[PDB]
């Protein structure tokens, strides 16, 4: 009864107040400061639940269900969360009304159903092949973080980017975002940032008297110890005149060689680890002409083991005469401040990385989230094809077409639906709100020029307070992630109702 | 006297606040947090007292006769428990006016009997040939659970699963549910579950280099260690020239390849154990061509040991031309995400599995929990052959028979067995309270809507709130499910009359 189910909705109402004034394209922005000293201000939902640990139960299930949403993108899971809330408080009222949870579970679902389809019944098709549209989406994506200078620089990309990868496995897409690689060096400002046609490798040459540039590179991702064996673990001896000295340590050195003779018998113009390089290792790399670098994450051997077409080698008394990769150029350009491995044409096409550099060491951070999300995001847009105009138009559509059908939906069921509906708005006032204007004189205002049939896609303009047809104004968004998020907001909505006591261990 | 039998009455009427809420098949869940930080939050009554510590001795009382009721599934427990603790109830009023508990449950024992022969003599006779029928039995059992979606799909399988390992050992039947597996693995949504005909491994296999396929096979279900032999705890030892390590290793490794060639001694396209396998011994086997799992289960060892004919062999030195299983096809494909064992058309036909697929590493715990509960249910329909419709048709028939009863019972038992049937009537306002509906006004309108001789099957559809025959909308019950629950339940209330005090130690 009325005993816990009270603390979970508060606990939910509790989430959604750390959210709300960051919802919207305007919004505000939360700051963390680690325990460490070191200070990050964001406004992606993600980072302010992860960073913000969070306890009662129910508020964990609300985000397990909005972060672990239904796809790519982080977007929405803000929606999901914040709209879930909202249910929850006009859910409220009802309970208020002695209305059994029961019905008001009934009410949401027959309402998310009819809000669902009046988005797919009104959703417009896009393709891949107009560019100029995706060139929208993605701002209408990025546009919403910190770094909103000339972000038309980066959403340019962000399309490139995700077409590129792109393929049609059965008239079915399917875009791996795997295939994508994302590295990060401070300078600059982020206009110096850019897209490399393959894969990146961020950490300089391992000695200055190599190849800094081969022709046709024959790579070789050898993964495993690459350094004279310590001889200690295996024997403790002593030891009487040089004789014996001079015949130690020539074959023990001749001992790491054979392992570098055993991997260049596959011939390879380039070869690299994810392990410390021995420097006498190195000296007789460096007159063989071989390419190598040090240590590596182990993150980017993979994303470049399928980019070149070759495999990571395991134990290099295996290596084949296929398991390196091919490539066209590398090279070593000190771009920034430091200097960086490339590995442009690869073998392998569908298969390129972004540089970010946003100059400070956490503006970059951000940059690289965002970045996150508009790539994913649009990514999703192809993948389904279908996408409306944002702005809190498809809000209030959902209500109108909603509060129509409330009446027939039957006794008290109705006034479920009818506040599925006025909770929805409530979504758009929030959004008003953070844009500085008044939530209700807009939201009437607005909902009252949608009267006119031609106007469906008409939202708010956060920067001049009117009504405008927000598809002519590009910004769309994929009619996917802000469905998703309602079946995920009820989905939670619903649950914290279903609930009727909670006894833990 | 009143001094203890007070408490225990007190602690029965506890346990009854602690389902109550969740009875009915449109019941409210109750949340649980493990210590560990989990959550599950379920109605599953055995869950709802195993993960609910209960201390008062009268209580663990009730449980152990609810949960070790008299059958297979768990339905039915949540029943014979708050009814239970309605008959305390409704016994303590009468103890308020003063008659001896010893006749309270004289009352009670023979309101009883006829409570009981009341539902054979009215109870339908169901044959395992009705297909049609299981359909609808088998969801008036699961879909009272969290997963209500797409349950014909389940219902139906369900079916099929039980109908599947049935037997008739001199016309009578005998149906074993060990000869059913249940594993479950995340991925998609619930519609992706399905049967397989023979059991199914869930360990990838152990080498790439092993067939992954193999025709009419001879599984060798060997449980021992099979790991080269650790030599340090048999032997400390020095060492001089490598002379001695070659006869060393080479023999070493020459005695594990020695169990592996007594095992093919009787020549298995598969073998699989309970144990760590060593990597040199997995190239050995690789060579040979055979197909070996890791460590497994013992669990399904035995459920895939008499599923294909086979033993489970203890010693490897005692290995026979027929301890080993035969089948027809073995694969591995990767459904889902992980890659899974499966050996369909097994050599013994009466033997499936289910797989579980929900999507969440939650959801899919509890679409076990149904399906268990499911099957068994619909496994004691078969095994007995009566079957009612539930929907609180039985209370109120149980009621009114019992009350024309009682007039002749006796001068003070009387009022017992009124009570009896008046405390049976809860059962079903619960049920409707927690329906979202005015207890009293439709039991009233229902136990009123029995006048009528022809509508024996007639309960309240808990979506409309009115009276209509359940039996004529697919909601049907093993007559002998809630029939024990009765028997239980009268168990249990009278045995906290018949206890004046509790003296512990
Ligand atoms: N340029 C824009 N003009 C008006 N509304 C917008 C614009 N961009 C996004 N929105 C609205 O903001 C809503 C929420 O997005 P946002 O606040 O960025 O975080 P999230 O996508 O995680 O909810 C979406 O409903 C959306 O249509
Ligand atoms: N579809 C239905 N309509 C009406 N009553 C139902 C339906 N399904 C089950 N019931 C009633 O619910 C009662 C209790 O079942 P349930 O609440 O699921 O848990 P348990 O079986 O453990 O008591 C049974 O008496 C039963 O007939």
């Given at each position: 009864g009325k005993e816990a189910v009270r603390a979970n909705i508060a606990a939910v109402k509790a989430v959604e107040e750390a959210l709300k004034s960051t919802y919207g394209p305007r919004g505000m922005d939360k700051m963390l400061v680690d325990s460490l000293g070191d200070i990050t201000i964001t406004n992606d939902g993600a980072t302010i639940l992860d960073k913000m640990d969070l306890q009662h139960p129910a508020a964990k299930l609300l985000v397990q269900i909005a972060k672990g949403q239904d796809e790519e993108t982080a977007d929405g899971t803000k929606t999901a969360v914040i709209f879930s809330g909202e249910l929850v408080k006009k859910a409220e009222d009802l309970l208020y009304k002695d209305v059994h949870p029961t019905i008001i579970i009934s009410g949401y679902k027959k309402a998310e159903e009819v809000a669902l389809q009046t988005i797919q019944e009104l959703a417009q098709t896009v393709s891949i092949n107009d560019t100029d549209l995706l060139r929208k989406i993605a701002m209408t994506s990025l546009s919403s973080k910190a770094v909103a200078g000339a972000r038309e620089y980066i959403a340019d990309i962000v399309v490139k980017a995700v077409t590129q990868v792109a393929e049609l496995r059965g008239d079915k897409w399917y875009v791996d975002l795997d295939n994508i690689q994302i590295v990060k060096k401070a300078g600059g400002s982020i206009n110096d940032t850019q897209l490399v046609y393959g894969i990146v490798v961020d950490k300089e040459v391992?000695?200055?008297?190599?190849?800094?540039r081969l022709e046709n590179a024959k790579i070789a991702l050898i993964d495993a110890s690459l350094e004279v064996e310590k001889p200690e673990l295996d024997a403790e001896i002593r030891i009487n005149d040089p004789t014996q000295m001079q015949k130690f340590l020539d074959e023990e050195e001749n001992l790491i060689k054979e392992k570098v003779d055993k991997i260049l018998a596959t011939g390879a113009n380039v070869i690299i680890c994810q392990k410390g390089i021995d420097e006498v290792a190195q000296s007789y790399l460096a007159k063989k002409g071989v390419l190598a670098v040090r240590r590596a994450k182990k993150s980017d051997l993979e994303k470049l083991a399928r980019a070149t077409g070759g495999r990571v080698v395991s134990?290099?008394?295996?290596?084949?005469?296929?398991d390196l990769g091919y490539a066209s150029l590398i090279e070593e350009r000190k771009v920034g401040e430091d200097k960086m491995v490339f590995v442009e044409g690869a073998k392998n096409p569908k298969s390129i990385s972004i540089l970010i550099r946003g100059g400070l060491e956490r503006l970059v951070d951000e940059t690289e989230r965002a970045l996150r999300d508009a790539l994913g995001t649009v990514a999703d847009v192809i993948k389904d094809g279908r996408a409306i105009a944002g702005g809190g138009a498809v809000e209030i559509e959902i209500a109108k077409k909603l509060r129509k059908y409330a009446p027939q939906v039957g006794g008290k069921e109705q006034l479920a639906v009818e506040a599925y509906a006025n909770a929805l708005e409530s979504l758009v006032s929030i959004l008003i709100e953070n844009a500085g204007f008044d939530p209700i004189d807009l939201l009437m205002k607005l909902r009252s020029t949608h009267?006119?049939?031609?106007?469906?896609w008409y939202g708010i303009d956060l920067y001049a307070g009117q009504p405008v047809d927000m598809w002519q104004k590009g910004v769309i968004e994929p009619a996917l992630v802000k469905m998703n998020a309602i079946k995920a907001a009820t989905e939670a909505a619903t649950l914290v109702l279903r609930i009727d006591d909670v006894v833990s261990a």
């Open positions: 391992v000695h200055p008297g190599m190849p800094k134990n290099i008394d295996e290596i084949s005469e296929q009267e006119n049939e031609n106007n469906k």
